[PDB]
Structure 1
């Protein structure tokens, strides 16, 4: 159609526009990536935002009369206009030449457009692996590992999160080369074996689309893309094409020593000792002995923090250095009563878990002190 037109309640646009205006930024790569694609056809309004690496599509039912067509408009300006109109407003939109008109009451906005024919498409693929799971299960999987992803590393594949299907479980893995996080959850369906890397920005969007309601999450994985559906939202992302490290060989083998302690007391002791750790290197010393943990931190000013804790430990005495931020990131992600630490020696990785659950495991490599 040439004369796109539609009328819809303000309320029906707000959630779609926030979700679709999300995968965007203040500086688009190309001017058209700062716009949303609007399509009207056969009782549906479609809204699409993209950055060429991922895309978000929302569909809105059109009950009132409308004319088919498509255009693109500045995303943030269109969103701000609709949000800024009063509660219960009705919004009438129509194309007039090269401008998109937005009308409500006696408020009139004329927006610039770019041709819909120039807008990118992240469609044109078929899913190989498909499944559904509760939103809470996806949120739990991402929250348990996201903090361990790399930050702008030269090894591009570490700037992402591995998503793995195996048997009846979905698993996530994140690592930055110093520490690793892994979490597996049952989803109730038998799955083929599949491993893909979702990029950093894709992981952020998958989380942002979770509303906490009872709408199930439907995931589709292709060879170079992943797609997630929740209600009338569809999120698509390109996959990172690389070989991710194997977590099963990164887990410490035959752990000689086992320490167990209250999660919160251990966290608060590390958080206090961190204050007097070196602001760049963040190194703390752990001294483990019979039912005792001693944590010490010093900094270039020669200030010192010392924490002594009662723990359950019966192995050989050992001293080991850690970046205190990597330990705190783990303890913050556990949210449990008791934690277990599995150690080998001072120059080898340590495995940290909830003392009650194996669903999540954390591996932190030490520092030399």
Structure 2
């Protein structure tokens, strides 16, 4: 008996967000859950890992109820309808009836009872921009399908008052810290699965907006008023990353981010397609870059850098270095090195908020 009227654009906005998480084994998983309670329409999409909820206030008289309908089909019908049209939606004999202007649609349904949180340990509000920065500055370093399952995601840590993101695949690490002034009384850690965290970052579009965060023992919740995002957590312990951060780095290199990125990209063309190895030769004011492949093709480049100290010959995966440079927001970049067998520490020119660790390759 569920029935409501809605403007095309009012339905389209939450429908597009929700359909984005809809990808399926169970047939109901391909469906969007529609719930009319009073003058509110709720739209829910899930893949069992993440759940996204969109909400719309209904203007004209609406009859309550709940149903599930093919998410992609309803979104495509909504998108294809003329701009600003009023859509009439009703449930009739296990079918969804859609009317808009001279267009009529009948969709198959699945019962809402078949559609598939968690006390909060910590809850705080944060700028969408600050949370998105933490994810976007580190997400490239997360492992993908590593047997060490706890690496296939991002650590979100609250400590002191600081919110920190940590991502690693065992070869390289990315970390970003922001003083959000969150009272915690203890260090709190959560591992958000890779698919979930990447979805969340894409949802954080409000440059001026705020997001309410709830950290639970097995879930994370992000609320913006227009949407509620819920993700299950990776049930494991994140490695002791503090133990792998290089501390005694004696070789400080200051270089131009663009010059280094351009030289690494040029040399990468002639590096091994699988191993992506490049050789770095550091000396006073100079960085020599060399790359070669099995066909004996070779690329060489010399980059002027701010460096005074002893020589260093070190091997690196060029893609790992390019990944780091792609997230450095300053014109200059700091590389802190020691020996050929030890990690490179990378920072922005003017702050230590972001830190990148890259293990070398044997030459």
TM range (shorter): over 0.9
**Distance change in 2, residues 1:187/1:259 (3 Å):** same
**Corresponding position of 1:82:** 78
Name which of 166, 169, 181 aligns with 2:162.
169
Contact in 2 for aligned 1:261/1:339 (Cα 8 Å) = yes
**8 Å contact kept, 1:259–1:313:** yes
Aligned to 1:147: 140
The answer to whether the 8 A contact 2:246-2:343 is kept is yes
Other-structure match for 1:17: 15
Query: Contact conserved, 2:129 with 2:208, CA < 8 A, in 1?
Result: no
CA distance in 2 between counterparts of 1:285 and 1:48 reads 51
TM-superposed CA distance for 1:213, in Å, is 4.0
Instruction: Give the match's secondary structure for 1:67.
Output: coil
1:135 equivalent to 2:128? Answer yes
What is aligned with 2:190?
196
Which piece of structure 1 moves more, 171-180 or 328-337? Answer: 328-337
1:209: how far off? 1.2
Query: Of the candidates 3, 6, 21, which is equivalent to residue 4 of structure 2?
Result: 6
| TM-aligned CA deviation for residue 315 of structure 1 | 2.1
- Tell me how far 1:152 sits from its aligned partner: 0.9
The answer to whether 1:284 aligns with 2:278 is: yes
Q: CA RMSD in A?
A: 1.0
SS of 1:128 mapped into structure 2: strand
Which position in structure 2 is the counterpart of 1:319? Answer: 313
Match of 1:250 in 2: 244
Contact kept? 2:120, 2:214, Cα under 8 Å: yes
Report the secondary structure of 2:258's partner residue: helix
Q: Distance in 2 between matches of 1:258 and 1:351?
A: 10
Contact 1:323 1:367 in 2 (8 A): yes
1:231 is displaced (CA, Å) by 2.4
Tell me which of 41, 54, 59 is aligned to 1:58: 54
Q: 2:108 aligns with which of 103, 109, 112?
A: 112
Answering whether residue 26 of structure 2 is matched by residue 47 of structure 1, we say: no
Distance 1:298 1:213 in 2: 44
Superposition map of 1:227-306 within 5 A: 227-306=221-300
Asked if 2 retains the 8 angstrom alpha-carbon contact of 1:209 and 1:230, the reply is no
Match of 2:66 among 54, 61, 70: 70
Q: Is the 8 A contact 2:172 2:358 kept in 1?
A: yes
How far has the Cα of 1:189 moved from its partner?
Answer: 3.3
Q: Which runs of 5+ in 1 are unaligned?
A: none
Counterpart of 1:36 (choices 24, 32, 52) is 32
Distance 1:191 1:338 in 2: 35
Residues 344 and 213 of structure 1, relative CA distance in 2, 3 Å threshold: closer
Distance 1:19 1:342 in 2: 42
Which residue is equivalent to 2:93?
97
How does the TM-score come out when normalised to structure 2? 0.98
Per the normalisation by structure 1, the TM-score is 0.96
- Out of 171, 174, 181, the position equivalent to 1:178 is 171
Tell me by how many angstroms 1:258 deviates. 1.3
